[PDB]
Amino acid sequence: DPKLDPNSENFSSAAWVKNMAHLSAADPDFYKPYSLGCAWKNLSASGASADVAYQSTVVNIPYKILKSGLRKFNTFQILKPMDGCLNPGELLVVLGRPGSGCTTLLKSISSNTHGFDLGADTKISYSGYSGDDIKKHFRGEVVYNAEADVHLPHLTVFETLVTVARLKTPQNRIKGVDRESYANHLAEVAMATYGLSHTRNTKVGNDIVRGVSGGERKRVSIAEVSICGSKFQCWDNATRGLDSATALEFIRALKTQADISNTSATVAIYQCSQDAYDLFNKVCVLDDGYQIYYGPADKAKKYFEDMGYVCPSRQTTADFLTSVTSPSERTLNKDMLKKGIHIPQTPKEMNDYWVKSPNYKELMKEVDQRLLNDDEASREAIKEAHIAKQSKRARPSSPYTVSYMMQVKYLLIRNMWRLRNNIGFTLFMILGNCSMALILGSMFFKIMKKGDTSTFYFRGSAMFFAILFNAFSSLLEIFSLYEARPITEKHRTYSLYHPSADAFASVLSEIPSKLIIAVCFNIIFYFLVDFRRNGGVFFFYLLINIVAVFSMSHLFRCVGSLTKTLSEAMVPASMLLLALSMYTGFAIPKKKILRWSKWIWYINPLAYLFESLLINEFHGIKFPCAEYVPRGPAYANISSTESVCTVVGAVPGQDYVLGDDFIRGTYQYYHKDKWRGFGIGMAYVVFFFFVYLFLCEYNEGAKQKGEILVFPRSIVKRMGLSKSEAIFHWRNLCYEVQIKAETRRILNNVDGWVKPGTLTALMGASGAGKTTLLDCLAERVTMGVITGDILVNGIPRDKSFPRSIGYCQQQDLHLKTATVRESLRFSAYLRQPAEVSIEEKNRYVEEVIKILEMEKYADAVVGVAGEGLNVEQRKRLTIGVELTAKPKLLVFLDEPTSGLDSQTAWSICQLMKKLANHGQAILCTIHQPSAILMQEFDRLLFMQRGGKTVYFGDLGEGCKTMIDYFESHGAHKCPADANPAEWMLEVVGAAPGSHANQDYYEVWRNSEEYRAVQSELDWMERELPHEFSQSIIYQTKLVSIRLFQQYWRSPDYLWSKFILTIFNQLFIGFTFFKAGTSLQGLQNQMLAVFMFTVIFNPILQQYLPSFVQQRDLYEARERPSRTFSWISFIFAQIFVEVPWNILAGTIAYFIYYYPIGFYSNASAAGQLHERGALFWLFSCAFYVYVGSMGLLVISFNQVAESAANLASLLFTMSLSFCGVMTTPSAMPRFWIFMYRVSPLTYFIQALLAVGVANVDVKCADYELLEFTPPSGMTCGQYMEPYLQLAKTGYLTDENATDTCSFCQISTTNDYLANVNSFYSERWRNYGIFICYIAFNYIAGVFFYWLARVP
């Protein structure tokens, strides 16, 4: 009964673990009990130095790389020599100020040391194993839980836990159960023993996606680590966000499992009750890298008090130890100074005192024997116990409990759950691909039916374009590879599974979509374009199409797994797409690919597959010639030696134009075998699948290096408020949200007020509606429906309210790059009243910097959590960013003091009390406040599970009023030495495994205190005494400057965009270097312009994820706070992205226009200086337009994948109805509508016109067709009748009679007009194109308001 984990009425973790120990001790031969500790000598770590740390940026990256090479061909020492031994079954607790080396120590002992590197002197021993042998075989018996709560935002809690449970279900589990049931039950127990059972089906969420609360997210990570069952745990920062009851229960769970299962655990906790601290066996203290004390937990005070300090009567032991490391709170023994004995004050001298202290001697006496202890039996049990723990067929020398294919199965189920969550994008993929099949099939339907020479070109074009559209679609899979990277790194550290298992699982998860897409697209396309013979001919094409799809998908995944970000991937991706575009053998045939760059043909899968497809679609099938050179009624009695078939490879004077001869000529595919393409294609598919798996596992990573300070080069190289009268009050506030089709009410009749000249706490268990209440009050709720009335002075809050409060998120939402002082300055400029000059605002910002003690890092770079700024620094920045705003009605504080050292907690509480004394009304939420913090609070609002008020009234001088209230209505007396803040939560039963004697919500509702507060509120309802601060243009200026500094100082995006343009356009231009002006040369000069636009997809998609990131950050904190309106945000995006695109187009001009030879045509025609300028303008316009389209598509999409797909689909529609794809003369139906409206039409017509217009052609011998004219007549007289209707010329020999060679076209204007391209049209095209850009930005600005703005 007490161990059925879904039975919340009775479940008791201790019972479950004791029972499982009784079961696992029953047959030690089968369960193989074992033990694991450690012991370390002279542990020292060192890392980078300020001489090399800088804020990388576009200008400095080249020099930075050069100096990095020099560095490879004064390192900051972080952990100065340490020691200690940790016997199995004994907890260890690490204490120190934030920045003192705690997490680095934990990472060091658990052989998880990415980033820094240990000293050569260090010596670690996991009871016989060296550090490396843990990585090589047993990584999994030593688990480090980083402070960062990293999860997939959308995967619910139960799925998150059950996946790892599955992955860790041992063999030799209870010898009566199957794998699935055991995994499910293990997940249920793990999530019931940590109070997570009511979040069974809620999104784990993240700092942006609203899901489980921060404390619940931390507990999800704790439970995930717990399910593992490792015998050595290191908890980086366990109690960040946990209340003072759940934290105690977590520590008790560790103690229980340690004393029952010989587990060891080293937990670095920053605030811990006196009773919680009593549970630990060994204590470690750190100060700026030095080890001050290591030994029994209970002797800590008895040892430090011997040094010369003294404990205040109401300071807990852990707070005392942390205090000794702070020069302010520390207190010296006045008597001992009188005696003349010195007392170490600086960390170095405390280390000197300790190393000389006897305690260090008895520490060494035991460390040495554990490090020198080798029995060849202790490590035998671990080996025997481990291999027995694995699946039947797993490799014994592997650190993963379950073999490969099982890992793939479970990760595949997880990825299928991800697909379920994102079903919208995949459904869009399928629908859009089908619709593009039906659209392209429509652009040819009525043409192919002719069966004459018309098929020899159009069917090939349609085939090539279907393949290239498949290529475009495959490029969208790069987006998937990046979401799960941090999570797979996390799981790698636990040795759950091979990363290649996750890669394989992603591939499999995507296969079904690709088969459905391929079969539908191919059946439709074939049914209305190609040969239409439903014999095996069709099925062969189906096979080759699917093989091409798979080959492209694997190639793109393999290249996209070479980088750290999507933007960096797009450089390989664009190069590869472009190569797979031109070099397939239809764009530019084999005989034509220049000798300079030939090798790309052979390495091209699509080239071989297209060769096979053409063999299929032309071998042994004949069509009749059309389009003879001399035609019309002017000729009769023609002769075989007197007419010519314009189709290349045609037999002379005969209609038997066999397809074999065709392909032999045009594409040189003269070989017989069609199966060649299939084999080499499948070889590519398999080989690159294996390369992708190797790349994602053996040489891939996304791990953070550490909280280093960046300090941009420009800096390092040179190195309250007045009164407000309005009260704030609310009543009956009730809030309900929808989960799994079953709504849950998370606030219930919460009523209370906060009025000026007061400082009102807000405590309650994690999972109570603290943050939910605050959001409901600050107008930040996004889902559900609130009821009841909030007010200000008895009037509903006006539109000016959201800016008049100051609300500090419990999550830290700031730019990666904007420095601290810069962030404060930005906020002060935009939010503080406009009547004060910038000088005053800047002075006040510096005053805040002084007040909050940030000066020694005011210029650092915010960076990412876990990567660029400590937790204490990040929280101080988060509250300063709002102090500087000068709020005028309230100041909320969601978590001003949670998860950071007790001394800094007290400092922030002193700041809060000062502000409240000055006049501000504060309402802060508090977790684990020591008794010395509770004495600063004036009122208290107390919440039960489910967001039910359980107290609201004064705390009193010594917390007397709340104590009296709770004891007055029935509750066990609070001990004199007990902390009131913790006794109160013990009574309410906030602990996951504990329940109260009665439901105190009813108690409160029935109390005279509740009637008192209700009467207060009713009276105060009888009370009686712009949206943004700055002008819209001003805030637009500021946000645009910030975003310019954001693209600057963010090299991965701009520098990648350049590299992409540079190399891509270089590749295009040189593929078509100086194409000439012949028929085949002119064809290349048309293709190059036509191929200039294929880059639309990758260059557009580089931008989308960056914009998604800025949009998430903006709408997370700065939209509800009304720092600057949405229109300002969009205008900043536009004004910042434009000029960079202009520069990109400028460079593309110079690296593209000249090599192809356009300048030669412009100069020969005598119009150089105009055509150069016009071509430059069109390049700039194209790049601006690509940016604009990227902005338009993303405006109304939550996900970049769907937006990118929409952009690619629109691009393909605009492109298929363009160029020579289908001659506009051949499409007189209504489908011309998209032709006239598409922008690629105007761009390409204008660009061909400028590039190749008004110059003469020079046919080469291989292109000159020839015929023998009628006897006696001369060629000129014989062709003049044709010429009057032909409006062409270039007859080779006018007066010859035996034979004359001819060219279909004489003036290039003829060829351009053939595609409806005109030189006189150039300017109107530019006007239309810029108008399209303008409309596109108008629609992009509109759709944001339509969709994202509430």
User: From the CB of 381, what's the least distance to ligand ATP, in Å?
Assistant: 33
Our CB check for Mg ion shows the closer of 704 and 810 to be 810
The entry of ligand ATP, Mg ion, none near residue 700 (CB within 5 to 8 angstroms by kind) is: none
- Of 706, 756, 1224, 1276, which lies in the binding site for ligand ATP, with binding defined by CB under 6 A? 706
Please give the residue whose beta carbon sits closest to Mg ion in the complex.
771
Q: Which does 705 bind (CB under 5 to 8 A by kind): Mg ion, ligand ATP, none?
A: ligand ATP
Q: What is the largest CA-CA distance in the chain?
A: 136
Of these partners, Mg ion, ligand ATP, none, which one is at the site of residue 78 (CB under 5 to 8 Å by kind)? ligand ATP
Burial status of residue 1320 (CB atoms within 10 A of its CB: 0-12, 13-18, 19 or more): exposed
Contact 941, 766 (CB under 8 A): no
Given the structure tokens 């990131």, which residue do they identify? 1109
Pick from ligand ATP, Mg ion, none: which does 47 bind, CB < 5 to 8 A by kind? Answer: ligand ATP
Q: Which is nearer to Mg ion, 891 or 1204 (CB)?
A: 891
Residue nearer to Mg ion on the CB measure, 774 or 830: 774
**767 marked as part of a ligand binding site:** yes
Tokens of 948: 């039910």
Q: Contact, 264 vs 284, CB < 8 A?
A: no
Measured distance CA(681)–CA(606) in Å, rounded? 8
Annotation-wise, does 769 bind a ligand?
yes
Q: Decide: is 213 part of the binding site for Mg ion (CB under 5 A).
A: yes
Q: Tell me whether residue 547 or residue 860 sits nearer to ligand ATP (CB atom).
A: 860
Q: Is 771 annotated as a binding residue?
A: yes
| Cβ pair 948, 748 in contact under 8 A | yes
Contact of residue 1176 among Mg ion, ligand ATP, none (CB under 5-8 Å per partner type):
none
Rg (alpha carbons) of the chain, rounded to whole number? 37
Structure-token match 């709340």, residue found = 962
Angle, alpha carbons 1232-1233-1238 (nearest 5°): 100
Residue 705 touches ligand ATP, criterion: CB under 6 A: yes
Binding mask 85-124 for ligand ATP (x = CB under 6 A): -------------xxxxxxx----------xx--------
**Minimum gap (Å) between residue 131 Cβ and ligand ATP:** 18
Residue 1276 touches which member of ligand ATP, Mg ion, none, C-beta under 5-8 Å by kind: none
CB 23 within 8 A of CB 369: no
Closest CB to Mg ion among 765 and 909?
765
Tokens of 1338: 């108008």
Q: Is 246 in the site for Mg ion (CB under 5 A)?
A: no
Q: For residues 218 and 898, is the Cβ–Cβ distance under 8 A? A: no
Based on the shown chain and the rule CB under 5 A, indicate whether residue 898 belongs to the binding site for Mg ion: no
- Two structure tokens written together for 75: 């390192």
Residue 840 structure tokens: 């005053």
868 near ligand ATP, judged by CB under 6 A? no
| Residue 616 binds: one of ligand ATP, Mg ion, none (C-beta under 5 to 8 A by kind) | none
585 binds ligand ATP (CB under 6 A): no
Residue 771 interface partner, choices ligand ATP, Mg ion, none, CB cut-off 5-8 Å depending on type: Mg ion
Find all residues with CB under 8 Å of 435, minimum gap 6, and list them. Answer: 1209
What's the rounded Cα separation, in Å, for the pair 842 and 857?
A: 17
Q: In angstroms, what is the minimal distance from the CB of 214 to Mg ion?
A: 5
441: number of Cβ within 10 Å: 19
3-state secondary structure of 698: coil
154 vs 927, beta carbon nearer Mg ion: 927
Q: Considering CB under 5 A, how many residues would be counted as binding Mg ion? A: 4
649 is in an annotated binding site: no
Q: Which does 1301 bind (CB under 5 to 8 A by kind): ligand ATP, Mg ion, none?
A: none
CB 1154 within 8 A of CB 1168: no
> Does residue 810 bind Mg ion (CB under 5 A)?
yes
Query: Is 960 labelled as part of a ligand binding site?
Result: no
Nearer to Mg ion, 193 or 213 (CB): 213
User: Closest separation between CB of residue 897 and ligand ATP, Å?
Assistant: 15
Considering CB distances under 5 to 8 angstroms, the limit depending on partner class, which of Mg ion, ligand ATP, none binds residue 116? ligand ATP
- For Mg ion, the closer CB: 13 or 771: 771
Residues 436 and 1213: beta-carbon distance below 8 Å: yes
Least spacing, CB of residue 44 vs Mg ion, in Å = 38
**Alpha carbon 111 to its chain's center:** 27
Query: How far is residue 287 from each of residues 98, 144, 345, 674, 991, measured CA to CA in Å?
Result: 9, 22, 11, 74, 33
CB proximity list for 608: less than 8 A, separation 6 or greater: 676, 677, 680, 681
Task: Provide φ and ψ at 1301, rounded to 5°.
Answer: -95, 150
Q: Which of 323, 426, 771, 1195 binds Mg ion (CB under 5 A)?
A: 771
Q: Which does 237 bind (CB under 5 to 8 A by kind): ligand ATP, Mg ion, none?
A: ligand ATP
List, in order, residues 6 or more apart from 78 with CB less than 8 Å away. 45, 46, 47, 101, 104, 116, 289
Nearest distance in Å: CB 237, ligand ATP: 5
Residue 677 annotated as part of some ligand binding site:
no
CA distance 480 to 510: 10
CB of 200 vs Mg ion, minimal distance in Å: 19
Handedness of CA 491, 493, 494, 500 (dihedral sign): positive
Residue 77, phi then psi, degrees to nearest 5 = -90, 125
Taking contact as CB under 5 A, which single stretch among the options 48-56, 649-657, 805-813, 1290-1298 is the one that binds Mg ion? 805-813
Selected from 17, 21, 38, 78, the binder of ligand ATP by CB under 6 A is: 78
- Let me know if 594 is exposed, middle or buried by CB neighbors in 10 A (0-12, 13-18, 19+): middle
| Exposure string over 988-998, b if 16+ CB within 10 A, otherwise e | bbbbbbeebee
Question: Per CB under 6 A, does 147 bind ligand ATP?
Answer: yes
Task: Say whether 766 counts as a known binding-site residue.
Answer: yes
CA 265 to CA 373: how far, in whole Å? 21
Residue matched to tokens 């053998």: 585
- Residue closer to ligand ATP (CB basis): 104 or 197: 104
- Regarding 709 and contact with ligand ATP (CB under 6 A), the answer is yes
Nearer to Mg ion, 287 or 895 (CB): 895
Instruction: Tell me the closest approach of the beta carbon of residue 236 to ligand ATP, in angstroms.
Output: 6
Q: Residue 742, class by beta-carbon neighbours within 10 Å (0-12 exposed, 13-18 middle, 19+ buried)?
A: exposed
Closest by Cα among 17, 98, 82 to 905: 98
- Name which of 873 and 1085 has its Cβ closer to ligand ATP: 873
Q: How far apart are CA 1247 and CA 1090, in angstroms?
A: 9
Ligand-binding annotation for 340, yes or no, is no
901 contacts ligand ATP (rule: CB under 6 A)? no
Return d(Cα 842, Cα 855) in angstroms, integer: 14
The partner in contact with residue 509, picked from Mg ion, ligand ATP, none with C-beta cut-offs of 5 to 8 angstroms by kind, is none
Of 342, 340, 322, 338, nearest in space to 330 by CA: 322
1289 binds ligand ATP (CB under 6 A): no
Q: Which of 2, 47, 653, 665 binds ligand ATP (CB under 6 A)?
A: 47
Which of 4, 48, 851, 1113 forms a contact with ligand ATP (CB under 6 A)? 48
- State the nearest-atom distance from the C-beta of 765 to ligand ATP, in Å: 24
Least CB distance from residue 703 to ligand ATP, whole Å?
A: 11
> How far, in Å, CA of 831 to CA of 114, rounded?
41
Q: How far is the CB of 241 from Mg ion (least distance, A)?
A: 7
Query: How many amino acids of this chain bind ligand ATP (CB under 6 A)?
Result: 22
Binding site for Mg ion (CB under 5 A): 213-214, 771, 810
Contact residues for ligand ATP, defined by CB under 6 A: 47-48, 76, 78, 98-104, 115-116, 147, 237, 705-709, 870-871
Which residues are documented as binding site? 764-771
Binding residues for ATP: 764-771
